[PDB]
Amino acid sequence: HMRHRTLSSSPALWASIPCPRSELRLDLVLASGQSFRWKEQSPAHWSGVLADQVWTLTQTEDQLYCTVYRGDDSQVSRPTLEELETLHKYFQLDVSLAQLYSHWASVDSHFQRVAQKFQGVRLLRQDPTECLFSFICSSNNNIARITGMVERLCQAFGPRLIQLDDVTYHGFPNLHALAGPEAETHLRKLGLGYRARYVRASAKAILEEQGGPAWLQQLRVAPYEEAHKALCTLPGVGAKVADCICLMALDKPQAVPVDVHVWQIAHRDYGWHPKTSQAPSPLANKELGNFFRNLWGPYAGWAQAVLFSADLR
Ligand code: NI
Numbered sequence: 001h002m003r004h005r006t007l008s009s010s011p012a013l014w015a016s017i018p019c020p021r022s023e024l025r026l027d028l029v030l031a032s033g034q035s036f037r038w039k040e041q042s043p044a045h046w047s048g049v050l051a052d053q054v055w056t057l058t059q060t061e062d063q064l065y066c067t068v069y070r071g072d073d074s075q076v077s078r079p080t081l082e083e084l085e086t087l088h089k090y091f092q093l094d095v096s097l098a099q100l101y102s103h104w105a106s107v108d109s110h111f112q113r114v115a116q117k118f119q120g121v122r123l124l125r126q127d128p129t130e131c132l133f134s135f136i137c138s139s140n141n142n143i144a145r146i147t148g149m150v151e152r153l154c155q156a157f158g159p160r161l162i163q164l165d166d167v168t169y170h171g172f173p174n175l176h177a178l179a180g181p182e183a184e185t186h187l188r189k190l191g192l193g194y195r196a197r198y199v200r201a202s203a204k205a206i207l208e209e210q211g212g213p214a215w216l217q218q219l220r221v222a223p224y225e226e227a228h229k230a231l232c233t234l235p236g237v238g239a240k241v242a243d244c245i246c247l248m249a250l251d252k253p254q255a256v257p258v259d260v261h262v263w264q265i266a267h268r269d270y271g272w273h274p275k276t277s278q279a280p281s282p283l284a285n286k287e288l289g290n291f292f293r294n295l296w297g298p299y300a301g302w303a304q305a306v307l308f309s310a311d312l313r
Contacts, residue, residue, distance in 0.1 A: 004041045004164045005056050005067050015079040017088060019064040023097050025120030026059055028309045032143045034124050034248055036134055036150040039167075047164065049154075050090060051127070053083070054162050054169045064091075069162050092125050104296055104303045110269055111296075111303060118310040123248060123302055128216035130172040131249035132234075135241045136198050152190040153199075157183075175213060178203035198236025205234055216250075224252040239285055247301040255301045256289040263288065265307060 007014055030038035030046045038048035047056040054069040066087055068079045079087075088094075097120065105112035137149045157173035177183075178199055187196035206215060219227040227250050231242035239258065246255035256262075263280055266272040266288055274284040296303040 002069070002072075002162065002164055004045070004047055004167075005069075006042055006045055007058050007065055010067070013076060013078055014065045014067045015084060017064040017066065017084055017093070018062065019059070019091075019093065021059060021061050022119045023093070024059070024064065024091055024122060025118075026057060026064075028118060028121045028313075029091075029124065030057070031309075031312075032147045033308070033312070034305070035126060036143075036147045037130075037154075037172075041165070041167065047167075049161065049169050049171060050086065052159070052161060052171045054164065055087070057087075069164065071162050090125055092122060095122065097122055100299055100302060101306075104306075108295060108303075111307065114310045115306055118306055118313070121306045121309045123253070123305060125251070126249045127172065128220065128245065128249040129175065129213060131245050132202065132216070132231075132237075133172075133178065133199055135244040136202060136236050137192065137195050138241065138244070139195065139236065141195075149190065149192055149195070153187065153192070156186060156190060175203045175207050179207055195236065198234075201235035202237065220250045224250075224254055227252065228255070239282060239289075243289070243301075253299040253301050254293050254297075256292045256304055257301075258285040258288050262304070265311060266291070269307075 005013060026046050027040075027044075030048065032038075035048070038046045041047045041056075045056050045058045047054065049055075056067050056069075058065050064087075066079050066084065068083055070076075101115055101119070105115060133153070134146065134150050137146050137153075141149075154170040154172055155168070157177045158170040159173075161169045161171055163169065180200075183200040183203070184196045187199055190196075192199065206212065219230055222230070224246055228239075228242045228246055231237050231245055232239065237245075241257075243255045243257035246252035247257065260280065263285075270291075272288065272291055274287055276284055276287065278284050292304060293300040
């Protein structure tokens with residue numbers, strides 16, 4: 001029976017990445033919303049899956065402490081350099097948040113007030129497949145419910161990696177696993193509802209009509225507007241979901257997902273109304289997304305995430 005680690009209960013198995021807490025708050029970032037796969041299994045210790053490894057992460061004011069569970073295969077040891085470089089990339093630590101916050105507050109009076117309390121909110125750089133199917137599950141859904149759908153989906157379809165205490169960790173499934181003749185039926189038993197059909201159909205579509213997961217990497221290299229349009233050809237992927245994926249997995253920092261909640265924030269906190277009829281809609285939604293890119297600049301999606309974190313708490 002292997003156990004989740006804490007920094008005190010096994011110090012020899014942890015490795016540090018220098019990182020001030022003003023650049024990264026784990027409790028604000030790893031909290032369900034961007035990813036649905038991290039859980040605080042003991043206080044201040046976040047455990048979750050990256051690719052095919054399980055990690056536990058914790059931090060001081062100055063350091064990000066990391067430990068990785070490779071399975072029953074290897075002898076237990078500290079994270080390697082390359083494994084740490086993965087986390088560095090995952091948290092996009094090359095991007096200075098202090099500078100971004102400063103720039104956003106300079107033209108946005110409301111962001112300034114809000115951001116004081118909620119520093120260290122950045123965007124994870126997520127796997128496109130995981131991101132796509134997680135956000136297909138997000139339509140007309142809440143975070144708690146999405147988290148359950150995603151976990152149950154991984155448990156039924158993805159490979160087992162390891163078990164820690166009562167938690168069995170699964171990798172996110174590949175396209176082929178989600179595309180089969182039984183997939184939708186199974187996913188309905190897991191409670192996805194109508195979302196079940198879109199998961200299977202989008203997996204099939206990518207495989208049969210786009211040339212497999214290599215297509216998702218091409219979108220990572222394509223410009224935001226083309227990637228966004230391409231994603232909107234998938235079953236169940238409209239503007240909000242395409243924008244989520246653009247921002248969180250295809251390196252498009254200007255992508256700004258718009259739904260009824262963003263509409264709320266914008267109207268209440270920014271006084272925004274559409275300069276158009278509106279008797280929400282796709283053109284009005286895009287206008288709101290344009291309002292925020294106009295206001296915040298090319299990292300508008302990142303600024304939005306700060307506000308979404310502040311509102312949720
Ligand atoms: Ni009004």
